[PDB]
Amino acid sequence: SLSTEAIHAVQALKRLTAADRSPPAATAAASAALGRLLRADLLAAMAELQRQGHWSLALAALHVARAEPWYRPDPELYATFVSSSPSNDPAAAAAVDALVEAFIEEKERGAAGGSSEGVWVGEDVYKLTRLVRALVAKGRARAAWRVYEAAVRKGGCEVDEYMYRVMAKGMKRLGLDEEAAEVEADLADWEARH
Incomplete structure (x- = not known):
């Protein structure tokens, strides 16, 4: 309209x-x-x-x-901007990486940013995973890692097997093998539980 x-x-x-x-x-x-x-x-x-x-x-x-x-920050809206960005375009890639930094900052320095559960524990995992999926598909490996690390690893956001598989295979495919190894450790930790 x-x-x-x-x-x-x-x-x-x-x-x-x-x-x-x-x-x-x-x-x-x-x-x-x-x-x-x-x-x-x-x-x-x-x-x-x-x-x-x-x-x-x-x-x-x-x-x-x-x-x-x-x-109100919506990772799914951000996911749409990621997916619709032009592929293999350095300027757009840079703008997407910057958008991800802005998302992390707006959450962590936001009103909920102080103690004590943290900004990420109540995050909509489905929408967060959509953003991470979009970043990996667009080849933005560091950006995907940034989100995964801040929300899942550090922000204690309890996530599914699906998030781990997205990230582990994504990091490897895009050549971030140290990050891939971290995710594989997290996935293994998950598997030993279920």
Whole structure:
């Protein structure tokens, strides 16, 4: 559902970046074009940029949303940005890795960040696994490890056999053999239990 204000904002963001869609330019443009929008219109503008295939602009829209008072981190939404990013594109890969760092930070330095269960113990494992699946499929091995380590290993997020298999095979396939070995240890630990 595209409103008048969302349509205008999408057109402005495209206009502002017609010559330069690099992160600094897209970042400045996104705050200028989208910074007056209410939640519904901002998310509609983001989704329309996604639909048109303007991935970098849609990501810039996401980052505007992430700073809004109403925002709630959704690893499944992040998973969609990962899966829709262009494969084997260094700039997009860098932007995806940065998005994962931003996700980890927004959780760990968020309101729940202080004691004592931790930010990750109550995390939706299904959605978290979707993000990790997406990262591994996109070849973003370090990013996947970062999420797995922060949430599962360190954040004591109790996870399934499926998460272990995704990660163990993913790390190996992508050449992070030390990380693969860590996951295999975790999987073995799981197996000895069930």
